Amino acid sequence: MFAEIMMKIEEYISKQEYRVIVDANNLTVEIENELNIIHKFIRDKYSKRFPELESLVPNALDYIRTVKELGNSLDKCKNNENLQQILTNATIMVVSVTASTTQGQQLSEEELERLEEACDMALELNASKHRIYEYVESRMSFIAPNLSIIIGASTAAKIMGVAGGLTNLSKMPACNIMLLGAQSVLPHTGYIYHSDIVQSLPPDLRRKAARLVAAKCTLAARVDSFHESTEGKVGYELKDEIERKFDKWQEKPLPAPLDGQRKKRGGRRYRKMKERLGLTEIRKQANRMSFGEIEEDAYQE
């Protein structure tokens, strides 16, 4: 699949219809969980050498680069310029600290070369994913510029593909492009609920924001179903409107003490006016103190 898709991607970038775009996007969002598969394999196989790099480097690609960096030899947490390109100096400090006390046995040569080619194909998958991302953002900014500006060009390509192109994306309403890419995880959610610009806010701020991004991008979809606003000014204006509303959702003298004219009419509304708050009270033995007696225990109050 990677050859069939990405050699077409190479042919199309060397020239600088849309089925290759959607197939590339589906490929790369399968690349991320295939990279999760490769990362969990590398986590299980390297933890006999280092059972602590999973908790200290939980990021999958940084873990893959630092266990391709180290291997058997944890000597390379010392004065390492190559590890300084990967992790922070805090993370390098803490993996040097726990590489001083690892409680981990060395690997084989077959185990180290197996993990080495696993990390090398993991970097191959990462660079392939980013190549697909650059191509899909370039060709989606040419195909649908305003939708790519609003949502992000990868999600723009996803909702352009599952709807069936731009000219089917325009003649969809806003209430269906919200649920575009749907299917016990969250219900009535589409591809533009799991977008980064809809997850850039608290979890209860989410659903309404979907309806805000589904509507305006629908307008953007209609705006680039015909070939006007090729520079993307409608997308820029609408996206300023989107995050203006997002920032909108996110975070007198004393009166002159005249008395009342007065209530001079009674009954009707006024009995309800007092039945709200100053209603028919006890008016007996709740407002009284009973001069002689002590009814409670004496100083309980």
Q: How many residues bind other proteins (CB under 8 A)?
A: 39
Using CA atoms, how far apart are residues 63 and 53, in angstroms rounded to an integer? 7
Q: Binding to other proteins by residue 189, rule CB under 8 A?
A: no
Using CA atoms, how far apart are residues 154 and 272, in angstroms rounded to an integer? 61
Under DSSP, the state recorded for 256 is P
Q: Binding to other proteins by residue 219, rule CB under 8 A?
A: yes
Q: Binding to other proteins by residue 265, rule CB under 8 A?
A: no
Give every CB contact of residue 181 below 8 A, 6+ residues apart in sequence.
158, 159, 162, 190, 191, 192
Residue number with CB closer to other proteins (117 or 270): 270
Out of 17, 110, 247, 297, the residue judged to bind other proteins by CB under 8 A: 297
Q: Answer whether 69's CB lies under 8 Å from 82's CB.
A: yes
Distance of CA 109 to the CA centre of its chain: 41
Q: Binding to other proteins by residue 148, rule CB under 8 A?
A: no
Amino acid found at 287: N
Out of 14, 109, 184, 291, the residue judged to bind other proteins by CB under 8 A: 291
Q: Binding to other proteins by residue 195, rule CB under 8 A?
A: no
Residue with tokens 């705006």: 223
Q: Answer whether 207's CB lies under 8 Å from 170's CB.
A: no
Site string for other proteins, 67-96 (x = CB under 8 A): ------------------------------
Q: Which residues bind other proteins (CB under 8 A)?
A: 170-175, 215, 218-219, 222-223, 225-226, 228-229, 234, 253-258, 277-278, 280, 283-284, 287-294, 297-300
